Amino acid sequence: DNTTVFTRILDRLLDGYDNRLRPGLGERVTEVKTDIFVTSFGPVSDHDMEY
Amino acid sequence: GDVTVILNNLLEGYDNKLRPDIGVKPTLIHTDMYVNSIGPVNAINMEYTIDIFFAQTWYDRRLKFNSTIKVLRLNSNM
């Protein structure tokens, strides 16, 4: 019955969480490590100068 | 930390349907812009596309706090 223990874990995680504050609001600069996987380069519209 | 306490104290007894100074005086709003690109001006529809960064700044005596932090920087969650 891991569903109950995982529910308790999640509810302890979100208990007292403020989604308006970035992690390390006072003493850190957040480091967002991005990445991209281009599954398909769509058609480059020459009329609108878009792609 | 304490910023959560500040944000909670600002929204206790707050009614977001009433403009600041609802029955006192008009609200002065300073508006700025930044025109990125003015798109194609097609004459057929007599229209033209524009892309801007509309910024509005006003005074709200209800969102007034007194703590060590001077400014609160927030995303669209508030």
Curated annotation (Swiss-Prot), chain A:
Glycans are attached at N2. It is found in: Postsynaptic cell membrane; Cell membrane; Cytoplasmic vesicle membrane. It is linked to Epilepsy, childhood absence 4: A subtype of idiopathic generalized epilepsy characterized by an onset at age 6-7 years, frequent absence seizures (several per day) and bilateral, synchronous, symmetric 3-Hz spike waves on EEG. Tonic-clonic seizures often develop in adolescence. Absence seizures may either remit or persist into adulthood. Heteropentamer, formed by a combination of alpha (GABRA1-6), beta (GABRB1-3), gamma (GABRG1-3), delta (GABRD), epsilon (GABRE), rho (GABRR1-3), pi (GABRP) and theta (GABRQ) subunits, each subunit exhibiting distinct physiological and pharmacological properties. Interacts with UBQLN1. Interacts with TRAK1. Interacts with KIF21B. Identified in a complex of 720 kDa composed of LHFPL4, NLGN2, GABRA1, GABRB2, GABRG2 and GABRB3. Interacts with LHFPL4. Interacts with NLGN2. Interacts with SHISA7; interaction leads regulation of GABAAR trafficking, channel deactivation kinetics and pharmacology. Functions as a receptor for diazepines and various anesthetics, such as pentobarbital; these are bound at a separate allosteric effector binding site. Belongs to the ligand-gated ion channel (TC 1.A.9) family. Gamma-aminobutyric acid receptor (TC 1.A.9.5) subfamily. GABRA1 sub-subfamily. This is Gamma-aminobutyric acid receptor subunit alpha-1.
Swiss-Prot record, chain B:
Palmitoylated by ZDHHC3/GODZ; required for the accumulation of GABA(A) receptors at the postsynaptic membrane of inhibitory GABAergic synapses. Changing P20S: Found in a patient with idiopathic generalized epilepsy; uncertain significance; the currents elicited by mutant receptors are indistinguishable from wild-type; no difference in sensitivity of the mutant receptors to the allosteric regulators zinc and benzodiazepine diazepam compared to wild-type. Glycans are attached at N66. Changing N16S: Found in a patient with generalized tonic-clonic seizures. It is found in: Postsynaptic cell membrane; Cell membrane; Cell projection, Dendrite; Cytoplasmic vesicle membrane. The extracellular domain contributes to synaptic contact formation. GABAARs subunits share a common topological structure: a peptide sequence made up of a long extracellular N-terminal, four transmembrane domains, intracellular or cytoplasmic domain located between the third and the fourth transmembrane domains. Belongs to the ligand-gated ion channel (TC 1.A.9) family. Gamma-aminobutyric acid receptor (TC 1.A.9.5) subfamily. GABRG2 sub-subfamily. Heteropentamer, formed by a combination of alpha (GABRA1-6), beta (GABRB1-3), gamma (GABRG1-3), delta (GABRD), epsilon (GABRE), rho (GABRR1-3), pi (GABRP) and theta (GABRQ) chains, each subunit exhibiting distinct physiological and pharmacological properties. Interacts with GABARAP. Interacts with KIF21B. Identified in a complex of 720 kDa composed of LHFPL4, NLGN2, GABRA1, GABRB2, GABRG2 and GABRB3. Interacts with LHFPL4. Interacts with SHISA7; interaction leads to the regulation of GABA(A) receptor trafficking, channel deactivation kinetics and pharmacology. Gamma subunit of the heteropentameric ligand-gated chloride channel gated by gamma-aminobutyric acid (GABA), a major inhibitory neurotransmitter in the brain. GABA-gated chloride channels, also named GABA(A) receptors (GABAAR), consist of five subunits arranged around a central pore and contain GABA active binding site(s) located at the alpha and beta subunit interface(s). When activated by GABA, GABAARs selectively allow the flow of chloride anions across the cell membrane down their electrochemical gradient. This is Gamma-aminobutyric acid receptor subunit gamma-2. It comes from Homo sapiens. The chain holds residues 64 to 141 of 475 of the full protein.
